[PDB]
Amino acid sequence: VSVLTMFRYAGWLDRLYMLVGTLAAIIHGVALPLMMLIFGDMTDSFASVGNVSKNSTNMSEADKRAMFAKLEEEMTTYAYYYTGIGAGVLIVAYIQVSFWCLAAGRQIHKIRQKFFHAIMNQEIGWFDVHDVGELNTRLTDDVSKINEGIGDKIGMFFQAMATFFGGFIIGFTRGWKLTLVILAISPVLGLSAGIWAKILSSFTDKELHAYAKAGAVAEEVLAAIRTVIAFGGQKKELERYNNNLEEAKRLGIKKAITANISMGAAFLLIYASYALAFWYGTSLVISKEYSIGQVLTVFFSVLIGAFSVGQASPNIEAFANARGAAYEVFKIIDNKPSIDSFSKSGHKPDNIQGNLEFKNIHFSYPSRKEVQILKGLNLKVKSGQTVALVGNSGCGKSTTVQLMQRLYDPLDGMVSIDGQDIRTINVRYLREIIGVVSQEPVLFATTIAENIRYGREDVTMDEIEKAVKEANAYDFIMKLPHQFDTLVGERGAQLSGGQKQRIAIARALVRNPKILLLDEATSALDTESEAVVQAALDKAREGRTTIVIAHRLSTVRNADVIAGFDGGVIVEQGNHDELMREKGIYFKLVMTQTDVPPASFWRILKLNSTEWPYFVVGIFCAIINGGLQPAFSVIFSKVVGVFTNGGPPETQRQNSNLFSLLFLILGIISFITFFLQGFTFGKAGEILTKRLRYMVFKSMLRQDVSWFDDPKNTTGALTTRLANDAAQVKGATGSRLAVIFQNIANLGTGIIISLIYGWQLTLLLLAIVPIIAIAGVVEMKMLSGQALKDKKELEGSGKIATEAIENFRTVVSLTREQKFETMYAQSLQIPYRNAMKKAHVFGITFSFTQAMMYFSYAACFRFGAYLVTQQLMTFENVLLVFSAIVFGAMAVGQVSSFAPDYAKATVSASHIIRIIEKTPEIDSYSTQGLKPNMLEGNVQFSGVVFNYPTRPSIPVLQGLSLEVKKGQTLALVGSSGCGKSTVVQLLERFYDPMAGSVFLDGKEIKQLNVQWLRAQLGIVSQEPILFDCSIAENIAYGDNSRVVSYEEIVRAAKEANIHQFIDSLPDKYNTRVGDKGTQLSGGQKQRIAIARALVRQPHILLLDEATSALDTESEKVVQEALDKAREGRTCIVIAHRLSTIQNADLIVVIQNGKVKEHGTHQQLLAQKGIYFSMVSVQA
């Protein structure tokens, strides 16, 4: 059978009306050629009347009476014919929509009904085969996609074929010669599109690869930002970013030639094939057979059929997606095992049920998503035993609990029963005989008594009132309004843990159960209600058949037999007194267990007025490219005019002359004007996309502060804004020239053409164009005004579906199943009533959308008839009104297509505005006099408080003052690593101190030029920023006030010990490492990071964190570089593993932002405070 035979399944009239709607769609397709036919039929008659009026004419007014009487007699019969086709399309439109909404709805209601019930009759396999929430959500929307998968798309497919083949049958019958040419050009247009797609593709690939390099050049440089600021490499990296965008600017400009030429060639094939068909068509009259006038309008109906099949393709593509998501997951609705638990079957266990014995279990994990981790379990319980399990071990004991039901059934080992087996028996009785107590009861609610009744659906209030007492739930059912029928939200969203627990114990007791079973049930309770719950779980046991598991060895002694499970298998089996007399494994266990929505405006115009290269000739080009399109209709009007009303004189020469004019004027100009319009806005966008990207990336690379402290930013996410905004703003250029073009193809030429209308054709144009624009703008609202309300009826009906399965301990009561289906039988009924209603609404609006075609033709006939005919009827300008209506329909589509490409581009403008206005924290200041006498300085700190760029991370530095002298070490340690690290990272200016300040001596580092500061500061990175440059550059990523030379790369290699690598390899300083450093271990990377500080002679030096992940060589040969990098130069080092850096002339202990001890290392080893207490725990 077909896949669609399973979608359109069951029912009677539910299937039969699909045939009625299919027949309506066929007739609605055949009506479109018949509307073309009559305008042709009039053209045969008018080509006779009009030419006889120039050829053996009855004077020049008796023809205007005798011939015109027959024309208005005929037009009075035509007034029946086109009105009958009009009445037809109004009816079949509503019958087609009645199929789409009401016949589909007659299946889709029962499909949704049996879908919610199919989760319930999936019984066990719903737990294994994907997961709750999403499996319910995708299925809930995919059974909505089935509506299109059986609906309108199938109608549109048959309707377009009926227009196509119906038009072709008439076009063969009246003149197959031209109808064969319409077949022959279709593969040529398809081949042209088959070139256009390759031209669009294999230029964009290279534009993407050119940009991908500019992306990677931004990403690593922004991640490394404060280090690239400290080296000075911005003078290299800003041009690496620029030139990869110059390559993209060499590529996009060539696509802006080739794609525009390939579209112009497709337009040229259209103008040329139409012109050749017209000239061949009149040659098949004034020489030859199989033409007249009407045949041309018949051949145009075949082209309307090809357009109708084009309009069907997006509906067939939507139908392919409606096959898509729905038909595969339809197997989880049915073709699943579907019976697995025996949900409404089985004979009763009238051996009372109780006498279980598990044997040689090796079973699966629950849901089979994890492997069978359990190996070895055997376990007894018999009628008149509390068996208590000891040796608790999580999932490896919880499997034994979930195996107590038709939810998991053993395969790896067995259960044994003293009678008929528990896998075979009555599943409702099996749910209700046991009180199955989990610490968390995941349960749907509405009242407390209804939640208790979700244990067993047959109850009396006399059972309920005892159940709330003996579960000890009575305290809150006395405090709450309406008591046991007190109102509560879904999942119990107004109840604490111990309250839900005592309600779930009442939900057990109301069964009159014989057995108690406990999923570790003392765990996760509140310590008030844990005791009140234990007293309820003791009250729930009349000296009777129980299987208890708990973290408290109280309920384990409130019992009859211990069963011990150190790992797996039963190791001990005796009384709690016995295993404490004889002091076994139970006694061993007793000894341990007792985006920017404010879219911008105005400023955008002055910004683009600063960005753009003023190619204003593209505006003139868009105007003339628009005005050329109605000139096709002017020359075609002149062909119809001379052919209907010239008489025979010169006709073959007039047709040949107008053919030559038509072919040349459209083929030459339209190609050039589309090409030059596309190539002008393309080149404007090539400047804009490059110029914006350079300015915003340069702005980012001059503001880390107030943008990397943003928890709402991510480096790659900013690189997506660099991707998207610079492309969206490019689309926001060419679309505006397309809006200029369509205005001139429409009213900007159409009103000038109306200066030669006899007012009747102006009334015709004005009666149609705004009304068809209003119709589509209403049709929009009619559709969307259902869909939002349909979604909210479905959403409310979805909450009560997910609440039926996430609340999985409702499958452990199983009698609420058909009560949920009873809720769904009313809930699915409100959107189905909405669907029955909208079948009329869409019926009348889609019917009115046909009525405008009858009205258009009927007005065009009845505004020429009699009143213009008496003058001689206008053999011109009638065609121009229809072309202006087509340019009006084109205009509405062109303008509404670019509406989101206003809105998105105004959001991209808000993103661009934030980043061009910058953060003023890392710029070229000059209030502090830059003095050379203090490159090493005497760095003063005073009153200092600091909180990290992660802004919630507390003011961790708190009132500090310190100094470090010219050439001195200042080693820092402190109670949580923040007391040391913040002092380096504020001197980096990677954030400002919120109070206090820091000074080079008597002049402020908050006010010193950040690039002068970053000329004297060296900084050691935990990770070297790395593209595959030479080793020389992979030390020296630029310099802020120096010149890199042989001597500095010698010092930086030798002092940092990294010359171990550089003097060894091929090429020495020239050689390679790959992006991120393919052969660079931690020890090499930190020795490179030391070299990067040293290669500019750093008069002040900063060692951020004195080990990364280092040990052995990789640590001690790094310390052998740390000691060589400090001393004689003003060096701050934040001590980590104190068995790296303890060598310093001064150390300071910064406890929670204040000094607690200080001195040289040996003076602090004497101080028996914090420092010696931090040494005396490292070793």
Ligand SMILES: CC(C)(C)c1cc(C(C)(C)C)c(NC(=O)c2c[nH]c3ccccc3c2=O)cc1O
């Ligand atoms: C916005 C909305 C409601 C989806 C809508 C819009 C239009 C436009 C804007 C193109 C008139 C249309 N129009 C069309 O699809 C068509 C417009 N002009 C034609 C001219 C000749 C042959 C077919 C069409 C056509 O299908 C239909 C709509 O349903």
